Design a protein around this ligand. Structure first.
Ligand SMILES: Cc1cc2nc3c(=O)[nH]c(=O)nc-3n(C[C@H](O)[C@H](O)[C@H](O)COP(=O)(O)OP(=O)(O)OC[C@H]3O[C@@H](n4cnc5c(N)ncnc54)[C@H](O)[C@@H]3O)c2cc1C
Ligand SMILES: O=C(O)CCCC(=O)O
Ligand code: SF4
Ligand code: F3S
Ligand code: FES
Lengths: 577, 243, 119, 130
């Protein structure tokens, strides 16, 4: 194994990863930072984000409104000490993004425009057309080029981290093109690998979002926080699960059933609003969960239109007209045209709720540090205590820049204070990695990886849905256990070394199953209904602050068991009632 | 019901075993909605599990998709089988060295992008002072050019790049032009050299095929032209500077 | 691999010229090929508009001289410029390309300049 | 040592023969030939015109040789093609914002043909009419 020295190593070149990269280079110019990514930095899932990044900008706004909004939308599972900090650095970070060249859509007076997302009463969502992610990531990536300090490792698959004596000391990654292993020594390491949306059968996520980092963290004693909370997006294309931005419904789009009935009024979100002026919290703009839940019910009544792609409801956008559509909905216009064959001005688009955002992730303090000194998690793969039981729409992209920076800065200090570990046990850890790999290559059995995949995705959908019942959560837990077993009987047929994807996809599948197990186990153990977690069984249908105002922590022991702990929820100035 | 099948030719190449890329054929089931990326995946899961390719977004936004299809630079995730009933040949992105299967060395492209300093330059403004002012009119100047997904189709398209691998190429130029035309940036001088080189804008004979294939409708050809004009302005100033 | 700081290209002069060249040639050559190429040699003209007397009267006027010069020279720079690049694209190896083509232009420019300062 | 053997496909002299989009580009560039051919003709013309009536007549005789005519017709076809394609490309050099949008190529294309038409007439007028 070729060895590389670094002051700190970032795993993941997404938005948060890059934001940490830059942060680190500005905080110490003489640093050797290793930016490591299994794809090129501008391929990261972040680029597909369309809605926008949230930050207090309007005169009549207040950070306390942003705060309230988060904690309330988070159903009081937020770390209020963390939320407070987060809101306070949103404008700073959004402004700075503008400063580096992000082309935010502007008011005619040439200042940044903002729109409403995630139900926030006051609109504080900064946006660039509907390619906000694309601009943010590209801005961040293109920015990162001007720091000599950042050494990039593109198309490098991170296999494991190195740890001894409660401290991270490096990592081991494959050079994907060459097929050889590498070891980067760093006294502090940032996990920015994004979430695990890809463990569901239907989801809005890019193929690369497979939970790797989380899985890695699992292998070292680090728990995953609040993995039961998984957010579906009310409106996704059938089949692909391709996201149609809420912006559709903000501009006045309507959701109808097989009788062209606007059904949402019949579910507590009525009285039907006129086609012209939609209203926040009413009808199509009702709260997220209620809109998805309503789909389920409508399907129960047999009111869904049935396509070969699946049972769907209609998102009607015709009444918007040509001009209104191309100014704000051009991307949504081309997607629907391409992937379902629908001109949104000519006819309605099929939609159905789809798996979207992983609220859960790697446990971290207010400083993004995990229980392993020098090891950090940030962004979708992490849990800083920001989102609680439900993330506010547009707070995620905001989080990348806000905490990305914090992480880059915090990791800089741990790398400076490190002192040395024991190189023998460290080089042994690496021998360990290398060996576990040869273990997976040589493994025989003739189980097809793609079927264990196909089947995990299925169990996730059927067991961990909008609505959840003990019977199904159990069947999923069970199913996962077999698949975990079957996984050990998988044969990687492709033995080549130049860009072996058969191998890579298989490793990510490994991680999926560990993570999947943590959602499923967490979900079942939560005998209550909170946020994205909705149980139908008796005495679990409502919010329980008496017994369940606590985060779920899921650990994975060497024996392969998924074990749960609970921890308290820091509250400052906003106790529930 | 019963799904129709399609005989899809895919040019395989393994550097360890093969001396040259060789065709391979795969029956894929499809319907109206099936993309090539979908097809590729079916092959990997079912037929040839050593079939390596790049993808991610599945919605023509990340840019990792790019390959040749019946000799046209296209995006797997946006190419639909329903259109290729009469035979479909799939090849690695043209004008790039094939590394393995549908996976090409994108290096020159990366270094190219990097060389034009694609980032705001010489703006001393700081975050506490709030954001720069920029009108929709000012944005309109560079906006369209800011939508490149670094897919690289426009390079497989470009016969000048094909004949001069040292030509920084349509994307790179476009991306530079975007920053030069950003009202917020003052690093034009820092970018001209690269654009002014023979390998810069001056390698473009305006075939204009770049803009034709560009899945993101960026019209890089137009930026290269606009860059030709700027290089000439720049040439004159520097001829008339005796200073 | 991509070099740190490249050398400025010369092309903006030739491109400048070829610019004017292609523009003039585009607006004006059509008419001109029609007259000289078709109308004159086929006698399809009113009375003696294209008689040897009248052409000469014009050719010897100030305007006419300037006009014929541009008319001959501008398309030369454009067209030769293009043929030079056609060599590369057609993968033909040409000794002293710039000197051959752009030289040829300069000569015929002169030959013409002489011609319209009168022979 | 490395197991990868990056394969580089060779670009052949005939590359443009493949795809029609390229052929059309070759054709566009083909218009340079007749352009100069014609400019050359004008030179003979110009000098024969200076060597008096007898030489000019033998120049006008040249332009009557059935082959020359056929070539000059082609010259005109070339010319028009050059004009049409040129008019499509020049507008791309402009970056012009008319109230908050980037103006298309069409407004300029039209102006350019408008000017071409006026010129075409004005010359045909002055040449033939007086
Ligand atoms: C369609 C869609 C729209 C969205 N819109 C919005 C929005 O409008 N507003 C908002 O706030 N949020 C939005 N989100 C959520 C938000 O986009 C994501 O949570 C956020 O982009 C995650 O950024 P990240 O850096 O944490 O993850 P990513 O940006 O996905 O990070 C991925 C990076 O980690 C790397 N990586 C992963 N595993 C490995 C490995 N094993 N080895 C090496 N590298 C690895 C990848 O190569 C890549 O570089 C949206 C999400 C989706 C799916
Ligand atoms: O609807 C959108 O476009 C974004 C949904 C909220 C988010 O993911 O931030
Ligand atoms: S200009 Fe168009 S073709 Fe070229 S890389 Fe960018 S997006 Fe792809
Ligand atoms: S195809 Fe190539 S020649 Fe110029 S117009 Fe586009 S870069
Ligand atoms: S998969 Fe992202 S562009 Fe095709």
């Amino acid at each position: 194994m070729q060895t590389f020295q670094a002051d700190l190593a970032i795993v993941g070149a997404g938005g948060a990863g890059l934001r940490a990269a830059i942060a680190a280079a500005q905080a110490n110019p003489n640093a050797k930072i290793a930016l490591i990514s299994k794809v090129y930095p501008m391929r990261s899932h972040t680029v597909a984000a369309e809605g926008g990044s949230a930050a207090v900008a309007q005169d009549h706004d207040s950070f306390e409104y942003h705060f309230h909004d988060t904690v309330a939308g988070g159903d009081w599972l937020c770390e209020q000490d963390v939320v407070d900090y987060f809101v306070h650095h949103c404008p700073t970070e959004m402004t700075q993004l503008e400063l580096w060249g992000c082309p935010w859509s502007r008011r005619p007076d040439g200042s940044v425009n903002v729109r409403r997302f995630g139900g926030m009463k006051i609109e504080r969502t900064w946006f660039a057309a509907d390619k906000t992610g694309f601009h943010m990531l590209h801005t961040l990536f293109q920015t990162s080029l001007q720091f000599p300090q950042i050494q990039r490792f593109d198309e490098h698959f991170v296999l494991d981290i190195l740890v001894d004596d409660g401290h991270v000391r490096g990592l081991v990654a494959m050079n994907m093109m060459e097929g050889t292993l590498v070891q980067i020594r760093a006294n502090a390491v940032v996990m920015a690998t994004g979430g695990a949306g890809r463990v569901y059968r239907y989801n809005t996520n890019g193929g690369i979002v497979t939970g790797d980092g989380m899985g890695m963290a699992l292998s070292h004693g680090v728990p995953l926080r609040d993995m039961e909370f998984v957010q579906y997006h009310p409106t996704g294309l059938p089949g692909s699960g391709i996201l149609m931005t809420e912006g559709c419904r903000g501009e006045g789009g309507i959701l109808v059933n097989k009788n062209g009935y606007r059904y949402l009024q019949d579910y507590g979100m009525g009285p039907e609003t006129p086609l012209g002026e939609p209203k926040n919290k009413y009808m199509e703009l009702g709260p997220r969960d209620k809109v998805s839940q309503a789909f389920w019910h409508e399907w129960r009544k047999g009111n869904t239109i049935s396509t070969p792609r699946g049972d769907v409801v209609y998102l009607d956008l015709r009444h918007l007209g040509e001009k209104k559509l191309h100014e704000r909905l051009p991307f949504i216009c081309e997607l629907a045209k391409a992937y379902v064959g629908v001109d949104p001005v000519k006819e309605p688009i099929p939609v159905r709720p789809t798996a979207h955002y992983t609220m859960g992730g790697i446990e971290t303090d207010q400083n993004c540090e995990t229980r392993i000194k020098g090891l950090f998690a940030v962004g979708e793969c992490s849990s800083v205590g920001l989102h609680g039981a439900n993330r506010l729409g547009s707070n995620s992209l905001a989080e990348l820049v806000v905490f990305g920076r914090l992480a880059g800065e915090q990791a800089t200090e741990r790398a400076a204070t490190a002192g040395n570990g024991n190189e023998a046990a460290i080089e042994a850890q690496a021998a360990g990695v290398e060996q576990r790999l040869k273990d997976l290559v040589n493994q025989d059995g003739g189980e097809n990886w793609a079927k264990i995949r196909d089947e995990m995705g299925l169990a996730m959908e059927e067991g961990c849905g909008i609505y959840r019942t003990p019977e199904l959560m159990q069947k999923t837990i069970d199913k996962l256990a077999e698949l975990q077993e079957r996984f050990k009987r998988v044969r990687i047929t492709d033995t080549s070394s130049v860009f072996n994807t058969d191998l890579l996809y298989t490793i990510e599948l490994g991680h999926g199953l560990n993570v999947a197990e943590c959602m499923a186990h967490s979900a079942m153990a939560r005998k209550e209904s909170r946020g994205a977690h909705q149980r139908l069984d008796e005495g679990c249908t409502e919010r329980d602050d008496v017994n369940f105002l606590k985060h779920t922590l899921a650990f994975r022991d060497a024996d392969g068991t998924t074990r749960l702990e609970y921890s308290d929820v820091k509250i400052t100035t906003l106790p529930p009632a | 019901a019963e799904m129709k099948n399609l005989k899809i030719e895919v040019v395989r190449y393994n550097p360890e075993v093969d001396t040259a890329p060789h065709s391979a054929f795969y029956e894929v089931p499809y319907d109206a909605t099936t993309s090539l990326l979908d097809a590729l995946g079916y092959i990997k899961d079912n037929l040839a599990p050593d079939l390596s390719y790049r993808w991610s977004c599945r919605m023509a936004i990340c840019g990792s998709c790019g390959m040749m299809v019946n000799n046209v630079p296209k995006l797997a995730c946006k190419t639909f089988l329903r259109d290729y009933t009469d035979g479909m040949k799939v090849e690695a992105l043209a004008n790039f060295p094939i590394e393995r299967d549908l996976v090409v060395d994108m290096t020159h492209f990366i270094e190219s992008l990097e060389a034009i300093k694609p980032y705001i330059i010489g703006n001393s403004r700081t975050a506490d002072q709030g954001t720069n002012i920029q009108t929709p009119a000012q944005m309109a100047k560079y906006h369209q050019f800011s939508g490149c997904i670094n897919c690289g189709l426009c390079y497989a398209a470009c016969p000048q790049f094909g004949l001069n691998p040292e030509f920084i190429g349509p994307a790179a130029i476009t991306l530079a032009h975007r920053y030069n035309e950003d009202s917020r940036d003052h690093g034009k001088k820092e970018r001209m050299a690269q654009l002014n080189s023979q390998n810069g804008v001056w390698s473009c004979t305006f075939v204009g095929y770049c803009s034709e294939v560009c899945p993101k409708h960026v019209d890089p050809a137009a930026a290269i032209q606009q860059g030709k004009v700027e290089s000439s302005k720049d040439f004159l100033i520097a001829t008339l500077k005796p200073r | 691999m991509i070099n740190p700081n490249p050398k400025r290209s010369d092309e903006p002069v030739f491109w400048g010229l070829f610019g004017a060249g292609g523009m003039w040639s585009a607006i004006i050559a059509p008419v001109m090929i029609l007259l000289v190429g078709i109308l004159l040699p086929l006698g399809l003209f009113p009375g003696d508009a294209l008689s040897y007397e009248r052409v000469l009267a014009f050719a010897q006027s100030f305007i006419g001289r300037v006009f014929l010069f541009l008319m001959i020279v501008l398309p030369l720079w454009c067209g030769l410029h293009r043929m030079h690049h056609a060599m590369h694209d057609l993968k033909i190896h040409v000794p002293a390309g710039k000197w051959v083509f752009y030289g040829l232009a300069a000569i015929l420019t002169v030959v013409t300049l002489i011609g319209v300062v009168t022979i | 040592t490395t197991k990868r053997k990056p394969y580089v496909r060779p670009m052949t002299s005939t590359w443009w023969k493949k795809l029609p989009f390229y052929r059309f580009y070759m054709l566009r560039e083909g218009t340079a030939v007749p352009a100069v051919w014609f400019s050359i003709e004008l030179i003979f013309g110009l000098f024969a015109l200076k060597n008096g009536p007898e030489a000019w007549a033998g120049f006008v005789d040249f332009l009557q040789n059935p082959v020359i005519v056929i070539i000059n017709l082609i010259t005109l076809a070339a010319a028009l093609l050059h004009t049409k394609t040129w008019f499509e490309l020049a507008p791309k050099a402009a970056n012009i914002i008319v109230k908050d949008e980037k103006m298309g190529p069409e407004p300029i294309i039209k102006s350019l043909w408008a000017v071409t038409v006026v010129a075409t007439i004005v010359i045909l007028f002055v040449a033939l009419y007086w």
